[PDB]
Write a protein that binds this DNA or RNA. Structure first.
Length: 109
DNA sequence: TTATGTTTTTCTTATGTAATACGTCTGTAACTTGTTCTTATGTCTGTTATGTAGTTAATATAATTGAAGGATTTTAAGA
């Protein structure tokens, strides 16, 4: 499965890495590989697409057995957008009091 | 005796972890602003009450109205 994101971004499940490509399976302009928690967050946001993803769902999926201080929620989804280079805050959207969403262009299965 | 492979230790970095501080989005409120329906009222008009002006041909030809045990003093008009 290949998820397409704005600015011609791609996250791959046929592999385990993110890139800026115009060819789905071809590794063009590699970003790298997200961490375990980053990959889990990206998977959760892509699965809840096109619906908004609730905050409690994210915290109980990323940290099933962790006493999260309620502020790692924002540091994590700040550096996740930074690692995808979302300087304009357009790649991942926050709808207030409803949750988060990630802008997916197309899905390749 | 000495060169070298190894293993353990310590330093360096990386992902997460949290704390406090401050900006954004959004939810309510103050301030106006346009539109439509309603209402009290000022004004015009018709109808009836009323207020005014006029006329009437035996003859008839100088009030009235009390008013009633007042004393005392002052001052103008008559002679």
């Amino acid at each position: 499965v290949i998820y397409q994101f704005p600015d011609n971004l791609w996250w791959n499940e046929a592999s385990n890495q993110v890139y800026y490509a115009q060819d789905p399976m071809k590794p063009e302009r590699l970003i790298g590989t997200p961490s375990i928690m980053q990959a889990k967050l990206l998977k959760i946001l892509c699965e809840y697409h096109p619906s908004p993803c609730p905050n409690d769902q994210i915290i109980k999926a990323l940290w099933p057995h962790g006493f999260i201080s309620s502020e790692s929620l924002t540091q994590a989804i700040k550096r996740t957008r930074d690692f995808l280079n979302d300087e304009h805050k357009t790649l991942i959207e926050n709808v207030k009091l409803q949750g988060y969403r990630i802008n997916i262009i197309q899905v390749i299965v």
